[PDB]
Amino acid sequence: AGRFTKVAAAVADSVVTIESVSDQEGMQGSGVIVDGRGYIVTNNHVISEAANNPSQFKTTVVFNDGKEVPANLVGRDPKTDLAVLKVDNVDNLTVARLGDSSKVRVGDEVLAVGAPLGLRSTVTQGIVSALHRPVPLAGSDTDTVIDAIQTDASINHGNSGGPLIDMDAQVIGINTAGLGFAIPVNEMKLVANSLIKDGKIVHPTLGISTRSVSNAIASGAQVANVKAGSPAQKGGILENDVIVKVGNRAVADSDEFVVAVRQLAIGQDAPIEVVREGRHVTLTVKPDPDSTLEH
Amino acid sequence: AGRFTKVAAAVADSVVTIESVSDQEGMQGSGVIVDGRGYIVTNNHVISEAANNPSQFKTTVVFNDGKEVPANLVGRDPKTDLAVLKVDNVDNLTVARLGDSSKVRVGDEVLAVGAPLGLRSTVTQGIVSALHRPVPLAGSDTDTVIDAIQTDASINHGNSGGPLIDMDAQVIGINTAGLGFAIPVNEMKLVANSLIKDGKIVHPTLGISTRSVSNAIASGAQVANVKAGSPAQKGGILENDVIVKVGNRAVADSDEFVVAVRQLAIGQDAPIEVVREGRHVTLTVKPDPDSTLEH
Amino acid sequence: AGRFTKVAAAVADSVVTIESVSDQEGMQGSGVIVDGRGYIVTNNHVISEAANNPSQFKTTVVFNDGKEVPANLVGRDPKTDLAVLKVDNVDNLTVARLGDSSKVRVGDEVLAVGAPLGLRSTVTQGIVSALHRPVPLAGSDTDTVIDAIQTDASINHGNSGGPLIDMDAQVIGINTAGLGFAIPVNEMKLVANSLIKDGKIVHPTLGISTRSVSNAIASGAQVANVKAGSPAQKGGILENDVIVKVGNRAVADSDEFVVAVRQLAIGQDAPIEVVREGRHVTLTVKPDPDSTLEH
């Protein structure tokens, strides 16, 4: 048995096919079994239309034995492209061994595994090309930026939602196709634990719209709009400001700005560093929750 | 010597360059020596225009020693993108070791080798991404679907027609560029043995045109037209039927339908499973040969 | 530590980020430390606009420690996409171990390393797909053709200018993104030694414009124009001639013609082989320098 062939066969029983069908449509994706009680993690864009129109869509999970079982949506986060499904009273489930994405290093050989019984599924191979790389992701759901694992293994429709696997057959990331990018497993563990526990995930918000700017004076995220009543208006952030640092994270562009805001604590004061007409101004903002009732 | 470098040098003498030239055109591809009598396998689209216009095209085979020898066409199958060439009275030919594509597994490391003396030839590396994957292939020749080996190694103009090689330096597939796909070697061995022996290959036909459909009622290949006097008209297949199984093979789309029909026996009765206005109807059809005189 | 992870960490300190900024623009690339006195090699298109407008652009080199140091341009060759930068009075520099690209073979595993602190940098993995492959490269600088190492590792904006690394952590090529191609290290060593020593590099010229032609009569580079007073006019080269050999190198297309001319000696007589209306004519041309004052 080949070295990658061995690793792929070991995780195959943990990867499932997710089929969402209507009367005149269908959609397939991949998923990962992360808990023996039937908890399945996929990315949000696989199930997005079934969540926005649950009256006309049916979502089933197809195991690698050919077994087809109905699925129920526990929760979903469009801001990290993550979702949690639940199959009830299924026994002898082979659960995936989750790893530590903080122990991953550039050059490590990886496998991007898709669901074996998927229609046009794929298993691709490569190395980790970059770590902590902000990447923008684009139905009626919002566009977001994740701080992702980059790989030269092909991520596509056939392995999206499946796991990124290290050479110890451990899940280190969730492939997303929304050249290849994956959601780190530690990020996935937080979002999934919150979605199982509450059915929702509350992310910080500041009320700022930004664009990217890079020159010899100051480089970062230029404020394009400040919302009314927002924490930014209360903190002093003005339009045409250039945010260069959000909390303890430097901001090189509007994409890293989105990631750094989600790393702030809700309700706690935070430093925001800004270049205003050639002067460095340090502002203090208190992030608000994006969902007040669920929080 | 590197691990892939060793395998590539071992098969290099078995891979040849195929050049087809006219008075105002040219075309190059790759080929594989499969028999010591001078039998060379390539894919049909490398030589297609030389076969349709033999009066104005000259086809030569260039070995890896720089030796250039005229070639003659034994036969070609546009439905599997395969062709067989013959060089006469060439000695000390290094023949490729053919493998068993039924012993190939997802994750196995492969090499897509092109002709070393080709103008813009390539040697690429990857793994087997999927097995038994139907893929459509598109001059005056017909479009077809093959049940192929999928790989994340790049298949392109520089290695099309050359071999897909396992880590034992064995040919397990024929690269075709008509992300990467290859014709399984067992499929290649059937087509080539028939083309050497008769100069033709007779494939089954039913007389059906189909399109792909996928919803919550029934998913498969929707009948778009039934030809007159066809086996389908005699068997009861009607338009707007949805074929879900052809013989012993389930059909998920019009592409798998084309592959499954070619797996039927000519002249023997076969079951065809159909969803007609919400009712499952099982029909019996007898496949006809696509070429009656050559059969 | 993984096998590629080990090699990548060993060369990381030798790879630097090159940032060129203006008042309303910026540009980043990668570079390689090749000499302890502060000599950095990148490709010409990373710094092209800073060289054509030095009054409005500032070029800095960012080491992997976070240290930012101003850089000065020693020289640049647009015809090989190579450039040499100099940082002054920087100590404890980890210099890259340069290899021999003549000892490289098809199938050898390689790494295309980018600057670790680069904004959107990449480390990709593959094999050498082809050797001595002419590839055309396209601001106000000239388009050129280099005789390059081809690899199936992805070369992109994140690793352009960085090194192509073998499994002994040795630089065997310079990645250029102007599927993947790299400048051989032996070619790089000549150009860099001349650029350090004189600040310029003098390449041969003949005064010919060519296009590619391939048919059954003769294949090669068809003369599209002969410049006045050029060495070609003095040697007898006429328009619509087909150059098939330049010196000791055969010419299959206009791209190999550009490479072969740069391999001739300046001021020495050279054979040029031409097909003129069905007759093979052997001409003698004396290459001129492209820069007479710097030579």
PDB file of C-alpha atoms in Angstrom, chain C residues 189-293:
ATOM      1  CA  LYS C 189      25.499  32.947 -11.878  1.00  0.00           C
ATOM      2  CA  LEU C 190      26.840  34.327 -15.171  1.00  0.00           C
ATOM      3  CA  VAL C 191      24.379  37.229 -15.325  1.00  0.00           C
ATOM      4  CA  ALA C 192      24.852  38.093 -11.647  1.00  0.00           C
ATOM      5  CA  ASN C 193      28.659  37.993 -11.775  1.00  0.00           C
ATOM      6  CA  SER C 194      28.619  40.319 -14.789  1.00  0.00           C
ATOM      7  CA  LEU C 195      26.091  42.648 -13.143  1.00  0.00           C
ATOM      8  CA  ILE C 196      28.074  42.870  -9.895  1.00  0.00           C
ATOM      9  CA  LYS C 197      31.336  43.416 -11.750  1.00  0.00           C
ATOM     10  CA  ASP C 198      30.334  45.929 -14.457  1.00  0.00           C
ATOM     11  CA  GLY C 199      26.733  46.914 -13.717  1.00  0.00           C
ATOM     12  CA  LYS C 200      25.712  45.696 -17.176  1.00  0.00           C
ATOM     13  CA  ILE C 201      25.458  42.573 -19.328  1.00  0.00           C
ATOM     14  CA  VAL C 202      26.138  42.657 -23.076  1.00  0.00           C
ATOM     15  CA  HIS C 203      24.158  40.168 -25.159  1.00  0.00           C
ATOM     16  CA  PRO C 204      24.655  39.342 -28.853  1.00  0.00           C
ATOM     17  CA  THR C 205      22.352  40.730 -31.523  1.00  0.00           C
ATOM     18  CA  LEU C 206      21.806  39.893 -35.189  1.00  0.00           C
ATOM     19  CA  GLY C 207      19.027  42.246 -36.315  1.00  0.00           C
ATOM     20  CA  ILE C 208      16.403  39.639 -37.253  1.00  0.00           C
ATOM     21  CA  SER C 209      12.676  39.471 -36.552  1.00  0.00           C
ATOM     22  CA  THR C 210      11.193  35.983 -36.820  1.00  0.00           C
ATOM     23  CA  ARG C 211       7.962  34.014 -36.653  1.00  0.00           C
ATOM     24  CA  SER C 212       7.398  30.306 -36.072  1.00  0.00           C
ATOM     25  CA  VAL C 213       6.639  27.913 -38.938  1.00  0.00           C
ATOM     26  CA  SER C 214       6.113  24.140 -38.957  1.00  0.00           C
ATOM     27  CA  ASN C 215       5.195  22.000 -41.972  1.00  0.00           C
ATOM     28  CA  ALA C 216       6.536  19.082 -44.026  1.00  0.00           C
ATOM     29  CA  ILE C 217       9.127  21.069 -46.012  1.00  0.00           C
ATOM     30  CA  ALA C 218      11.119  22.853 -43.293  1.00  0.00           C
ATOM     31  CA  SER C 219      10.302  23.807 -39.701  1.00  0.00           C
ATOM     32  CA  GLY C 220      11.835  26.670 -37.753  1.00  0.00           C
ATOM     33  CA  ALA C 221      11.964  30.467 -37.486  1.00  0.00           C
ATOM     34  CA  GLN C 222      10.830  32.391 -40.564  1.00  0.00           C
ATOM     35  CA  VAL C 223      12.621  35.706 -41.094  1.00  0.00           C
ATOM     36  CA  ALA C 224      10.050  38.509 -40.882  1.00  0.00           C
ATOM     37  CA  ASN C 225      12.422  41.485 -41.173  1.00  0.00           C
ATOM     38  CA  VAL C 226      16.137  42.171 -41.622  1.00  0.00           C
ATOM     39  CA  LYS C 227      17.352  45.418 -40.087  1.00  0.00           C
ATOM     40  CA  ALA C 228      19.513  47.806 -42.093  1.00  0.00           C
ATOM     41  CA  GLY C 229      23.225  47.635 -41.361  1.00  0.00           C
ATOM     42  CA  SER C 230      22.572  44.563 -39.226  1.00  0.00           C
ATOM     43  CA  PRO C 231      24.910  41.551 -39.130  1.00  0.00           C
ATOM     44  CA  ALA C 232      22.151  39.589 -40.885  1.00  0.00           C
ATOM     45  CA  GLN C 233      22.065  41.949 -43.875  1.00  0.00           C
ATOM     46  CA  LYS C 234      25.851  41.653 -44.152  1.00  0.00           C
ATOM     47  CA  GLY C 235      25.675  37.863 -43.798  1.00  0.00           C
ATOM     48  CA  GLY C 236      23.093  37.335 -46.543  1.00  0.00           C
ATOM     49  CA  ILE C 237      19.958  36.559 -44.515  1.00  0.00           C
ATOM     50  CA  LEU C 238      16.863  37.541 -46.503  1.00  0.00           C
ATOM     51  CA  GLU C 239      13.201  37.874 -45.605  1.00  0.00           C
ATOM     52  CA  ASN C 240      11.015  34.737 -45.773  1.00  0.00           C
ATOM     53  CA  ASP C 241      14.081  32.616 -45.019  1.00  0.00           C
ATOM     54  CA  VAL C 242      13.607  29.789 -42.512  1.00  0.00           C
ATOM     55  CA  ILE C 243      16.416  29.557 -39.959  1.00  0.00           C
ATOM     56  CA  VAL C 244      16.803  25.943 -38.842  1.00  0.00           C
ATOM     57  CA  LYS C 245      20.110  26.122 -36.963  1.00  0.00           C
ATOM     58  CA  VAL C 246      21.891  28.957 -35.144  1.00  0.00           C
ATOM     59  CA  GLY C 247      25.474  28.005 -34.360  1.00  0.00           C
ATOM     60  CA  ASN C 248      25.544  24.589 -32.688  1.00  0.00           C
ATOM     61  CA  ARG C 249      21.859  24.695 -31.664  1.00  0.00           C
ATOM     62  CA  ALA C 250      18.915  23.610 -33.787  1.00  0.00           C
ATOM     63  CA  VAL C 251      15.988  26.037 -33.913  1.00  0.00           C
ATOM     64  CA  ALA C 252      12.441  24.661 -33.836  1.00  0.00           C
ATOM     65  CA  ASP C 253      10.611  27.989 -33.455  1.00  0.00           C
ATOM     66  CA  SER C 254      11.124  31.720 -33.019  1.00  0.00           C
ATOM     67  CA  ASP C 255      11.425  31.165 -29.257  1.00  0.00           C
ATOM     68  CA  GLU C 256      14.412  28.820 -29.535  1.00  0.00           C
ATOM     69  CA  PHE C 257      15.897  31.265 -32.057  1.00  0.00           C
ATOM     70  CA  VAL C 258      16.017  34.021 -29.423  1.00  0.00           C
ATOM     71  CA  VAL C 259      17.729  31.687 -26.946  1.00  0.00           C
ATOM     72  CA  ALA C 260      20.279  30.384 -29.459  1.00  0.00           C
ATOM     73  CA  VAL C 261      21.361  33.879 -30.540  1.00  0.00           C
ATOM     74  CA  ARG C 262      22.239  34.749 -26.933  1.00  0.00           C
ATOM     75  CA  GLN C 263      24.522  31.680 -26.883  1.00  0.00           C
ATOM     76  CA  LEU C 264      26.730  33.017 -29.694  1.00  0.00           C
ATOM     77  CA  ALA C 265      30.012  34.840 -29.152  1.00  0.00           C
ATOM     78  CA  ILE C 266      30.092  38.572 -29.842  1.00  0.00           C
ATOM     79  CA  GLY C 267      32.438  39.419 -32.701  1.00  0.00           C
ATOM     80  CA  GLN C 268      33.101  35.816 -33.780  1.00  0.00           C
ATOM     81  CA  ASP C 269      31.837  34.334 -37.035  1.00  0.00           C
ATOM     82  CA  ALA C 270      28.936  31.897 -36.732  1.00  0.00           C
ATOM     83  CA  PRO C 271      27.123  29.493 -39.076  1.00  0.00           C
ATOM     84  CA  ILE C 272      23.454  30.130 -39.817  1.00  0.00           C
ATOM     85  CA  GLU C 273      21.509  27.418 -41.641  1.00  0.00           C
ATOM     86  CA  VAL C 274      18.598  28.499 -43.829  1.00  0.00           C
ATOM     87  CA  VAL C 275      16.006  26.965 -46.182  1.00  0.00           C
ATOM     88  CA  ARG C 276      15.427  29.387 -49.072  1.00  0.00           C
ATOM     89  CA  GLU C 277      12.707  28.388 -51.573  1.00  0.00           C
ATOM     90  CA  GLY C 278      13.500  24.701 -51.203  1.00  0.00           C
ATOM     91  CA  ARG C 279      17.297  25.047 -51.062  1.00  0.00           C
ATOM     92  CA  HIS C 280      19.473  24.710 -47.969  1.00  0.00           C
ATOM     93  CA  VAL C 281      21.847  27.698 -47.745  1.00  0.00           C
ATOM     94  CA  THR C 282      24.530  28.025 -45.057  1.00  0.00           C
ATOM     95  CA  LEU C 283      25.320  31.643 -44.165  1.00  0.00           C
ATOM     96  CA  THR C 284      27.998  33.184 -41.941  1.00  0.00           C
ATOM     97  CA  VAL C 285      27.081  36.038 -39.587  1.00  0.00           C
ATOM     98  CA  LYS C 286      29.156  37.948 -37.029  1.00  0.00           C
ATOM     99  CA  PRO C 287      27.062  38.880 -33.962  1.00  0.00           C
ATOM    100  CA  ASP C 288      27.207  42.485 -32.772  1.00  0.00           C
ATOM    101  CA  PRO C 289      26.825  43.648 -29.166  1.00  0.00           C
ATOM    102  CA  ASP C 290      23.438  45.032 -28.187  1.00  0.00           C
ATOM    103  CA  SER C 291      25.249  47.756 -26.197  1.00  0.00           C
ATOM    104  CA  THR C 292      28.339  49.173 -27.909  1.00  0.00           C
ATOM    105  CA  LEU C 293      29.393  51.705 -25.256  1.00  0.00           C
TER     106      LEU C 293
END
